[PDB]
Design a protein around this nucleic acid. Sequence first.
RNA 1: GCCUGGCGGCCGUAGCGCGGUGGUCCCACCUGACCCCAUGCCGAACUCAGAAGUGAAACGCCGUAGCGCCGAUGGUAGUGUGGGGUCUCCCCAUGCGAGAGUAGGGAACUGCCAGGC
RNA 2: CCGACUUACCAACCCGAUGCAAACUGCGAAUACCGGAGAAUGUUAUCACGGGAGACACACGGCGGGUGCUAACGUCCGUCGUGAAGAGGGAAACAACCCAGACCGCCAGCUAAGGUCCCAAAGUCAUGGUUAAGUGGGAAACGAUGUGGGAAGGCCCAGAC
RNA 3: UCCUCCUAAAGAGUAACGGAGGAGCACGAAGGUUGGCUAAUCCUGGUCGGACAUCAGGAGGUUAGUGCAAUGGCAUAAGCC
RNA 4: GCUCAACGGAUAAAAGGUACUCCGGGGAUAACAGGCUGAUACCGCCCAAGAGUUCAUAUCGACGGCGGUGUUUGGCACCU
Lengths: 79, 136, 58, 116, 94
Amino acid sequence: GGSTRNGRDSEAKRLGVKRFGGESVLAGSIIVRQRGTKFHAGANVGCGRDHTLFAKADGKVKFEVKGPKNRKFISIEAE
Amino acid sequence: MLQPKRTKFRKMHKGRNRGLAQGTDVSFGSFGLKAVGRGRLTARQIEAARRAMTRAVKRQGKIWIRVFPDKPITEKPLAVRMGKGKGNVEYWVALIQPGKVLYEMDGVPEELAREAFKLAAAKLPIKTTFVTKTVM
Amino acid sequence: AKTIKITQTRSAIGRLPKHKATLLGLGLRRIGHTVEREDTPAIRGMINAVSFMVKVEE
Amino acid sequence: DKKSARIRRATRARRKLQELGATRLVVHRTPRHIYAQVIAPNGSEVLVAASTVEKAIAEQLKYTGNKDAAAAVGKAVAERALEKGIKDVSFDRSGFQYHGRVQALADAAREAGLQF
Amino acid sequence: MFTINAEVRKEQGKGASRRLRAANKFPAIIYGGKEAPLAIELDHDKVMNMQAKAEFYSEVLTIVVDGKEIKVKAQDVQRHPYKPKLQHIDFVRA
RNA sequence: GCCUGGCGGCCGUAGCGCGGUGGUCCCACCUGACCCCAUGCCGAACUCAGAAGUGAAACGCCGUAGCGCCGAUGGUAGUGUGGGGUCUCCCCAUGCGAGAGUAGGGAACUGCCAGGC
RNA sequence: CCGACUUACCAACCCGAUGCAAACUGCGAAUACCGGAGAAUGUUAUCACGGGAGACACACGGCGGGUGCUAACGUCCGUCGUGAAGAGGGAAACAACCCAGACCGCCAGCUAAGGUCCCAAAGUCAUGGUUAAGUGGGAAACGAUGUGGGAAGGCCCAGAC
RNA sequence: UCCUCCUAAAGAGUAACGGAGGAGCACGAAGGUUGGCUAAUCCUGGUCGGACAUCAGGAGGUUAGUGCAAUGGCAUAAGCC
RNA sequence: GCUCAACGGAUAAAAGGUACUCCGGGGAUAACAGGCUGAUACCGCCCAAGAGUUCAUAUCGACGGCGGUGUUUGGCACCU
């Protein structure tokens, strides 16, 4: 028969890279599709809707593993 | 025989054959038919070597088959052009790397095991060797 | 500080763009060109990046 | 386990107050006593504490772990908080309901001057 | 008795180990849990003949390095996948 | 110094199992419930008022490796660059170098406040 | 009969051992990518705006793959190199392979790949071996007292084959 | 035409008449908030309950569930009242 | 107010025949033949359960395996 169909996305991964000086609201990890690979806990709580993680203060990205579940968190720390 | 009862997916990619085999030791039996060289071992060749073994040992002792034909191989029919989808699944192979113990034997004398392994090796495409259980 | 001599010995024609840019960062132009470069782990890393072409007088 | 269920009830508001950087007035309630702790937003050091097991609070009360005892502990913790000079704390239920001794402690802190 | 004459390893790595196997010797390691492990190389044909002797694994062996006798025991053997030869042995101090 | 409670840090060298141990200090079960309140019935739970009783259960502490968990050294697989046999796969120089196993470790450590001895 | 075997054939669970997976992951590289700092080098190579384009039929080779038959000078992608649009030397002849990027002239020298008996420039070079088929100078399973090297193993001067 | 996975080479992207599946809606609650709660499965005693209806106890730990494909999620639950 | 679903949507509005044909092009693309490849075809060999009365190999040889030729049906679309 026939089985040749596919969808499209054009980004699916992080943009902030833990040295990245992201200001204001830059999407640190857009189209993660989900709050579980990365959580936002440094600059308050990101993860608005479609779980896009974004900065809330002008500063450097921070990647870290916290919690009892060994979950990965994106933080924003000041320069 | 030796086609799996179910598969998650009907067809696979062709792939490439790996470096070296896991399962190089003689584990269950006392003698083994180790593989020296790469290739794909068809289920029909596996069955033919098994029958040669079993009749050579006269259905005495116990024989282990350490490989299984879990990869479906598709072939296009005759006088059809390229494309138009992937071909129909025709037969099943096991990918063999050098060092893979293919068969195992116990409960027989060593020379009778060597004769049965030689008659199986005459049916297999790849070059094989006789190995014995070693303690480590 | 101490300086070393780096001489090109092979051509840069079929090489990778990273290899060509490493020769540009070294300062080598011709197939016999020699340069005097100050001794530094960065210069040594460029030599190790393209070491099949260069020849180093210490 | 009742303590584990209480921690599961408390955890959502505890992480929400941790993310806001809020100085938490937490309350612990037992059948015998009630405890109040104003804790700095880092969560590691306790700024102000007032407990029913403290003898100065416990001598004035007919029964420890009463609603009157909860009001006395809330008044005491708000008095020590305003003596320390800190204000604008956020109240943590710590898994309990806002009812009875917990509500009485928070109402006494609000009356004595700790604003939420 | 099972005495093996062994030499210490000047260089470790896959290239050095393959150079040993090209020079018909093979690497080995000794560890005891009380002191630092010692990396050695062995004469492959001699240690092969001691493999073919079937009492190699049961009893206590004697490795001589620099004239020093070390009482060991064979823990595991890494064998070549499709040739008789062997690549690596680890010895536990007995 | 010891024990207990609360909030953390760190998240299996942190847990589970087995055995022992603690009591109107503290905490749990426990007494009663019209009343502050609740059960799509349930004073199970949530609450409130607390004369007695026991720590039995839970919880805390200690011991035990049985299971989880961590885990070298050495080797192997892979691979960047250059070179070479190649019919479909490898080899050499050099750089990086696992995973699984092995020896072994391991019955957490620590900060603030409060209470009793 | 409130049943004293659970079968000399098997479809489930668990335990111990053994593999396999593009659409499996309790693990996990090398590289690549993103950002920051620093030196040296590069005719600011980089970015923005504006004037003028062409091009949107690609090919082969290496690596990683789908498809095909792990077929095709096949087809479709990623990536690099070359040709396209690059002569010169080599592979006999040879777009794409190897070496190397031609401003012009020289009856000057040194080298790369590749070679050095004659065609045809340069070793009938030096030392140590191997092969006797013209292997070199096409081809597998499999077969054979071809002939070198190495580590061992039986019988044997109480007489081994 | 749109969505999900693989191909796809551990950033993004990436083709084929490649391998598999779905969508052209639904919901005024199936949205918001507050308060509360935790599954699949297995072993047992009892009304047609029989192997599976409903209780009670134990084991287990997310093997469930998500309005609907697949993937990534989810206990502080985004799952249930 | 769109199955403008050929979903960046030619128009509100549209199916066929041509062996009677015609033009502009293409070896960018098919038919014949050549080329590459050899799945298929044809030929040969390896193992030997057998049958051949006993006996594998006088003759044939299952289950399987490895090649050769260009040689059928094909694949590709390199030449025209």
